[model samples]
Target chain A: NHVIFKKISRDKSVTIYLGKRDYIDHVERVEPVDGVVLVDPELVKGKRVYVSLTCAFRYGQGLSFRRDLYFSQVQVFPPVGASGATTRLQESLIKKLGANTYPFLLTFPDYLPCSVMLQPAPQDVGKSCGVDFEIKAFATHSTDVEEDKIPKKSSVRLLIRKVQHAPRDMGPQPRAEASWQFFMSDKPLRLAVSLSKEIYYHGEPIPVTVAVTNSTEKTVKKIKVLVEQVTNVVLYSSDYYIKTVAAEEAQEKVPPNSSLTKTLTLVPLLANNRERRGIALDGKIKHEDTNLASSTIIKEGIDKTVMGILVSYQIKVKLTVSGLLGELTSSEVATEVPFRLMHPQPEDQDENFVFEEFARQNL
Target chain B: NHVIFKKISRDKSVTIYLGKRDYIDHVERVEPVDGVVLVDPELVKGKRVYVSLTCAFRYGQEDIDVMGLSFRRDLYFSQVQVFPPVATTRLQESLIKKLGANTYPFLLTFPDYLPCSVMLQPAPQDVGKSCGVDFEIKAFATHSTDVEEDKIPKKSSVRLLIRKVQHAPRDMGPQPRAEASWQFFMSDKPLRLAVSLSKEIYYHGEPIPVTVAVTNSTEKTVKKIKVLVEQVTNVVLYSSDYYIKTVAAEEAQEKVPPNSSLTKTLTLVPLLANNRERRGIALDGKIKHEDTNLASSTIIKEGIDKTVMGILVSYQIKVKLTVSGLTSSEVATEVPFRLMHPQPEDDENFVFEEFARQNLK
Candidate 1:
């Protein structure tokens, strides 16, 4: 059996890990790359072993063969020597895995797609899709090395995934306003909605600051605020909305000039939105269970027009005015506002990864 | 100038309306697909026309002609006299009058249990289209003269896309019981296996009661019988073995019958080793970027009029009859089923789509 080791990084630099499962995790919201690999020298026994890391994407195009988008492999074994970096990595591995263990450091180029592994959707029998990052180290004959061909089973492969995270804070607080003029009351009633931060993590309650003014003398029967997620198949130009929070469920109500300040929090959970479109706090392996679509606005500089799924959040407030005496009908007024939903990596969490990398670079 | 009218139906019948936009209305539920198309007959006093309604489903691998599952079902309405529905409501009347006087109303209906409409992401690069369920409807004058393809003007064919879905009940009955048997090489008797599920349907996190029995009629001794829950994902696009989730292998006593068969009840509940917990399966599945179980098996229409959609969500139980540690003998069986949670409750959608049309319009 081969000894396996892995590391991950986001943004620009690669960070090494001693393999702590917690507090140091990679999400698809961000790209994570494999940093280093160390193996038992007895396994290689001075034999020239070829080590390479590659990111490939595969999916089905029925009637056609499985498609593959493989990036150029970065050789990690028999690594390019004579560099100070190689020396640092060697010393790093020596301290971590003990002597006589070979070390291989892997670095991926920029702009490569994020790593995603689509678990099989039932219909996709015997096939797979999504992104994959793998590191394979195998003992090969020196002659085969020159030939540039590596045989399968000669190497062991490890599959790693890239995960996504929401933004910690947000810009341009989301807010909307609307007014309705009723026949009974000359002064129109007004509705306004505002959110504290444009961004939020899954499960975090989003407080919807709602202000409703019944300028008219009419008593408002019910005041409702709802937090909903809108998902767009922009390609199809079709969209669907899933309500994460509803005033009816919250048992919300408001009176005249009440300026009903209702703080409605919407936590997009896979279990919650299992019935409709929703963004999840985390991705569940179930394809049918889509997490609330993350805000397309996350991850600056990323082009979104080409993206298939676009998710946005909005808070809508509705008012039911008690119609004047004689008329039993109820007049309704409604309006909505937009906000951002995202999960930003905590500062301390990011700092831990950064701090670990700084020390590794020193070694 | 272009004119587009939409209609909706819950049961076996449908009523015509003029939604503010195209592709706005279609049939819903596991009910009959009654699609109504209204056209002005006065303008074309003595002309002939044909209207048609069709539902189709295409899997991945559309470009190549390899092997996978792709199905298309179509329904038709003709003679311009078959459906003579007169506008009743003021909304319907005003819309038909705007289209001109004496418009013919055609209601197209399909059998039942057609697949619900679904879509998938396009391939990495724009090549063609992706797999999923698709429903289409078309109604035109057939050029008022030429119903033939070549002669018909491009504008003559006004197409529409809609979906017919099913909301499976949450409470599913206990699975009847699936059984299979296979003979090991050195056996005088063939091995017979029978398996039954706790329930035909299940909610995530719930355990399944799998009662499996194996009959060894052969004189040779057997090793052990293992029961497994295999999630069979059949994406019409892939040739095979795309997302087959096999899990929870609970093995029983190693020795088997020399002249008798043993019965056993194994608690088989697939776990979500990954956060994809309670997930190992869900008929009401999502198609996002994770390893979701196959979409739930869709409603297979009763007849030829059914849509070509199906739930990727299907589960099976396997009973493996193995020989002594080294040797090999196995018998397996499966039961395909479905469940319901969120069935895209959408009557309010287009109604809200109408709301959005007015809001966005």
Candidate 2:
């Protein structure tokens, strides 16, 4: 069985082949982009030929396609002897696709930002904000011109994506509590919220347990449990957006001088919030869908400011307290516990062989 | 000498005539939108004819067009009988050329936005956040039969887009200036800062020259000076303040010894480039990819109508001196001034002959 994704230049001069377009980004490392290209030397006609990889980050879409080009590296291939094969995949491609074939490997920098996008509002017409990666092979008559300045007639571009997988380690249980008192009240209302664990996998249900005690004359009217994703725009330190990805409202009430405990289950899924603007999601390509942005896992000594958009998850419990007429005596007590939401690491080696066979047979 | 702006309905049932499409909104009072409509009685049939005025506020434009329709009011306008004639301008008198037998005159008035006509400037290459307040006059013949009315049957309705704008004030006030003092917790001496603007009123794109005078009488070394232009937006809907964005900012490092004083002049231009990714920043309303400046400072006349004052925008220049030895202390000063488009020497801007073509649908 052979699986090959290939693209040809507009001028029918060059073709690029790849086994996959989705690359996984492990926290500390990333999958290298390895591919093979078939070129026609006679069609080159002494022109300079090069292959380049770029990661373009764009935001302010629909407003302006605010784009910042990053990590663009080009390598000349006519002098193929200049750079030998550096990767195992490159060596294998050289041996299999023997004649007129060039194998290239590109690596992502350790500090490269993961793919993330903000959900576009309903009326947005063009592309929403997101990050994209592309590989292009082009031939031009001049050698001194810049990459993008070259003519497009002989160039081909393939869109690729960088994604993250949830880490394997799970932290300890998480818990938080808070207490508030009304004006002139002798005692205060207390709230304690806790999550089952410190880590949660996407598409899994999270159980949030909340306990409330009313030591004052105020009554507990309702409880709202929300799974909130806090997206911090680090450039402006105080600029942050808290979107309630999942929520549950319970009308269960408790009398004054009493206490109550309940567990609410909520699944934070992108499907449910498709139209909510400003909700952060995993970095994605143009058409492919993605999950929520993974909880920012900052390595030691790395300040979160290095990244533009930082995402974190929290389980918040808000208690709606009450009194007669609810005018001046009503108030809310809130408590939140932080947790991690991500994808679990892939568990087996069977998937790796499929990739190997796809490349092997296609070559 | 005679110019008339006119629009005809799609079904050819109604026609609207105006002296001009641009109305100058003086700070105290706005010019009325006066127009005359010629209705074809044969085509109008028994359907009810009404004229409506609308002021729509839209932000989050490429985001969703995020349109929030406001100030839509209709006059059943059965005033075909008691309709009194209002004074006409020299240009409008010419509009009465051969008035039809069924011609009727009407005038519409409303009260800020109450936001002034302001729109966010999009990028130059960006062919289209565009934000603006638009005013439209609609004359339509609708059936009395009740329906949810999803679409405003464009075939029978004619919409004339108009502009609502505020002109620069004629009087230039005294230069704006303010000062602040930062006193150390344990020490007795205090750090003082005074700031002043070059002029009382500045035009759009004009450089705002600010004079910052700092007196470091305390035992603190001033290490840095920051000058910023802050755009403050107050939303009537929100109980508290709405948004404060820095449209322009500059920081410089200088050494000021303790018990020493210094005076410096800094020029700052509040350009959109400095705040490309800054969220919620207000900009002058724009048509498409056309450029726009920061929203003009809000000016209210006496007895300002609070109801229409939905969103108010103002500008402030802030200067701060960072003292290193004062244990996390900074002395800052604020100055206020007017940023607006200049008033015309004459009403020359409304004389565009290119857009006078009437749609014949």
Candidate 3:
């Protein structure tokens, strides 16, 4: 019965309760955060107690630290809902908790990105970089004041995460081809690389196909396949991080005037590359590790600036020639095919508990 | 018998042979490249044959798609007579007789300021010529007139890639240490930081354990501590310099409150795995697609010119303390050290005459 409503202790003086903690952001719409804060009237001493909701985005560490309070809204104890409409969950929360329990609702704007973080190295300390949503309620003299600036030991904060899911419609398969000529050679070696699907779920192995045609005298000594995670830092146009998340070296060789085809599977997982810096990871909560960041899916009207770091994945194939000496006589043919790596929408498991169920079990 | 001599065929008429391939630089001097050319007497028809040794450096790539920003530069080059040697040595006579007739010998010496061999690790799927500096020793036949070697015909020329390398110093100096003390504006007591390394020189893949001591007597609290390896690079020719710092170790759980002190040691392995994308970091030049370690510290004898040093690399260990506040300030100290490969003891000293004679079957 008590587990139905999420609760927080604002010191010994006050407590806050929420119908639920997790919220989903549908491409077209987003769910509102509805909850109620319970206060002890004596602690207020006639001062009005106010509740505030904030969506904060913090990044960098040490000297480069930054905090952006994207959206912040506050409401007085007498009223309110973030979407400007009181829902059944908010109404039932005020009725069920009785005295001193006040309901409030807050909605996220469409432009605010879901929670995401850039994975840091083991030695990285301090705040690192991450996005978070916090609910704080404190007794203040005025509701018009800056809610975040208010300092009170009596205030409490509850952290929540906003996440996006893989869309229902996946695009077409990706394929690409390229060719290169060896030094002093007459013909080019052709290479074709492709992926089985456009969208890959987390923890799934990607099926990759590579085809090579050696039209020149140069022999293909080895085949190198790599899955690169391209992280585009939109703020700094030239600052981009392209890292190889997965790799395969196929020993199959192609001789002159020969053609070869083979399938190479690669798995991009975070466990293998924990020490690599700047890897985009799923939005993380404090003290929790997450999988790789899902591919950024933008709605039609959204701007690139709204999402600071955009992560994309691609498969690259290279056919190398065994050159004499160093790579002086060496030549390589390569091709790249882009794809999406994201999290799938989980199946609905037991709809969320409602206030009626709480009343039936407790009253 | 064939394994004793490394040979490369220029064409049906000519072949080039060397006693061995790899050469070593001993700071004070470098070994000379000594080789012999065996040619068909009828092909040259009494014309002179020339053997040239060149150190070529190529960077970037040449591609119509990449907008053509390729570069090819020659550093050290020399052409010596292969046929009709001014004088013949005992070792030269022995090698010439082994091949029967029409054999000539040449020796090429290395000048100061020639950079070590190193190639950049290209992107896995990259195409065209990646960045690298290589040595090529070629043999060609030409008429008595002055025809430039660059224009030498392909069929009459044989080129083989070789490597230039330097080994770690036989002896190193004393351990290195650095210290800094700061008096905070908000307080009278000063905070002190000291960092030290056990030795001044470390081999590649060797762990560098830095001993650090921090005394926080000021009013501000110490929130965290960090140690980093900073790779500093200087492109002398272009007058450009930059550095990249990778955190070697850090700790925040055992923070020093105000008026407290602590001493700890941290280990760091500065490797290319983390700093690959950071452009301009110098690396050891080597053959093939295999990856190599960071370039060794540049060594120049006193009074030697630095203009030809090309790229110079140095490393430093830094210790930083994060101070108290909503927005913190850092107190840092540093010390310099050398990272390189140890000179192998088993490789016997180079004796031109003895070494060449030993290669004979």
Q: Which pairs clash inside model 2?
A: A115-A283, A116-A283, A166-A343, B112-B115, B118-B285, B119-B284, B119-B285
What are the TM-scores, per candidate, against the unseen true structure? Answer: 0.40, 0.45, 0.45
Write one digit per residue (lDDT tens) for candidate 2, span A1-363: 335467778787777767676677767677787777777777776666677777755555345544444566555456456455666555555566666777777778766566666755443232345556777888767555554245687788876666766665667677665565443454757677777888888899999888788787977777889999987655323345677899998768877898888888999997777555767777432343556887877766766555556788888786666642122211124566778887767663111212232211210
C-alpha lDDT of residue A195 in model 1:
72
Docking class of 1: incorrect
The models' CA-based lDDT, in order, is 0.45, 0.63, 0.63
Model 2, docking class: incorrect
Predicted model with the maximum TM-score: 2
Name the 10 consecutive residues with the lowest summed lDDT in model 2 chain B: B68-77
- Considering the two chains of model 3, state its CAPRI-style docking category: incorrect
- Show the colliding residue pairs in model 3: A82-A105, B117-B285, B118-B284, B118-B285, B119-B285
Ranking by lDDT: 3, 2, 1
- Give candidate 3 misplaced runs (Cα > 4 Å): A1-10, A18-22, A49-53, A62-69, A81-99, A119-128, A142-149, A236-238, A283-286, A300-302, A324-333, A346-363, B1-361
Order of all candidates by DockQ, from best down to worst? 2, 3, 1
Q: Give the range where candidate 3 chain B is weakest over 10 consecutive residues by summed lDDT.
A: B352-361
**Chain B TM per candidate, please?**
0.45, 0.69, 0.74
- Per-candidate Cα RMSD to the true structure, in Å, reads 28.3, 15.6, 24.6
| lDDT per residue as tens, model 2, B1-361 | 5365667875788777777666766565567767667777887665655566556443322221122111111111111210222355444344445565576666667562345655443443433234345566776655545122222345566677666666675554565444334443327687667777767777777888887777778777888999998887764421223567778887866767888988888888877666545346655543232334466787765675643444577888987777785266676767777777776454222231422433311
- Give the best candidate by lDDT: 3
Model 3 over residues A233-307: C-alpha lDDT tens digits? 554233455677899988798998999999999999877675646676664422344567777766668787567
